[PDB]
Structures are given as structure tokens and as C-alpha cells.
Amino acid sequence: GHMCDAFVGTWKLVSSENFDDYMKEVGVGFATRKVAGMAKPNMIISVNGDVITIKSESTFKNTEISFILGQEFDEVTADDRKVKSTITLDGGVLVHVQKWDGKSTTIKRKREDDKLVVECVMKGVTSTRVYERA
Ligand SMILES: O=C(O)C(F)(F)C(F)(F)C(F)(F)C(F)(F)C(F)(F)C(F)(F)C(F)(F)F
Ligand SMILES: O=C(O)C(F)(F)C(F)(F)C(F)(F)C(F)(F)C(F)(F)C(F)(F)C(F)(F)F
């Protein structure tokens, strides 16, 4: 169970680019966009056998997803979309696709330098969020 060894630990947000535009394209409502943009989340990534957990903690809301690489699962996103999610390990990157309502979005969680970078894409709109170790 070593696929995710470069991701495990705790992380805190450094910077965010185009995040509100990404959320707009996804369809997130105004108030959720404003709370999300204001959060300084702490991310916890952990491995228990085959099951990986990604937890995001912020002042007003936490999320927690647990999954096996390659196995589709149900996710209720923070903006309350009911999506079908699959996360795979491709070239050292966690590639997460969410499918719902005839639409898709991809969240790539990757390593760059000493950082964990989250790249979100919806119909050509890309957000880049950089985390440092907590
Ligand atoms: O509208 C809500 O219910 C909310 F709580 F404001 C929220 F925006 F969804 C949120 F969950 F807090 C959040 F900000 F989106 C978040 F916590 F999920 C996040 F985006 F900050 C993180 F990065 F933690 F996921
Ligand atoms: O920083 C991250 O870990 C993240 F993955 F980029 C994310 F911010 F959590 C997010 F997935 F983009 C997101 F915030 F959850 C969201 F934008 F997708 C959303 F729409 F679910 C919400 F509602 F939280 F904004």
C-alpha cells in the first residue's frame, strides 16, 4: 500500500488561482463560493491498507472521502452534487474524475517541489491551489 506515500500527511493552503472561476463553471452558488474562497483548509491524506482517505478541514465545513484506487464510489461534494467518483494513480499523480448529470470535472492532486498542488478543471477552466506541509 505504498502508491500514495508522497501524499500522506497534513497540508495547509498557500495560494489559490482561478478558484472562483472554476466553482462558477461547476455551478456553485454565490454564498458557497464566498465561504469556500475564504477558507484556509487543512488537508489530511492517510492510507489504511487499500483504503485512502482525503479529509479537508475548515472553519465552517469538513469533508472526508475514502476510496480504493480505481474503484468508483459515491461522493456528495461540498456544494451538494451527488457524483460518481473514481481516483487512479497515473504518473505519480492522483487523478480524480467526478461524473454527474451528463457532466464531468477532474481534480488532480500532484506533487511539485515540496508542495501538494490541486489542479481542478471544468470545461477548460482551471484552478490551481498550492498546499505546503502543515
Ligand atoms: O457552502 C458550504 O456548505 C461551505 F461550508 F461553505 C463550503 F464552502 F462548502 C465548504 F465546505 F466550507 C468549503 F469551503 F467549500 C470547503 F470547506 F469544503 C473548502 F472548499 F474550503 C474545502 F477546501 F475545505 F473543501
Ligand atoms: O483545495 C482542494 O482540496 C480542492 F479540491 F481544490 C477543493 F477546493 F476542495 C475543491 F474540490 F475544489 C472544492 F472546493 F471542493 C470544490 F470547489 F470542488 C467544491 F465545489 F466542491 C466546493 F463546493 F467545495 F467549492
Residue numbers in the entry: -2 to 131
Q: Which sentences did the original study use to describe this structure?
A:
Here, we show that human adipocyte fatty acid-binding protein 4 (FABP4) can bind a diverse array of PFAS, including next-generation replacements for legacy chemicals and longer-chain perfluorocarboxylic acids. It transports fatty acids in adipocytes, − macrophages, − and endothelial cells ,, and was recently shown to regulate beta-cell function via the Fabkin hormone complex, influencing insulin secretion and metabolic homeostasis. The crystal structures of PFOA, PFDA, and PFHxDA bound to FABP4 illustrate three distinct binding modes that underscore the protein’s adaptability to varying PFAS chain lengths.
Notably, PFOA was found to bind in two distinct sites within FABP4. At the “primary site”, the carboxylate group is stabilized through hydrogen bonding with Arg 126 and Tyr 128, as well as a water-mediated hydrogen bond with Arg 106. The residues, Ala75, Thr29, Ala33, and Phe16 primarily interact through their hydrocarbon groups, contributing to hydrophobic interactions. PFOA binding at an observed ‘secondary site’ is stabilized by hydrogen bonding between its carboxylate group and Thr29. Both PFOA and PFDA induce an “open” conformation of Phe57, which results in a larger hydrophobic cavity, compared to the closed conformation of Phe57 in the apo structure. Interestingly, this residue is implicated in access of lipids to the hydrophobic cavity. ,, The open conformation of Phe57 is necessary to accommodate the secondary PFOA ligand and the terminal fluoromethyl of PFDA.
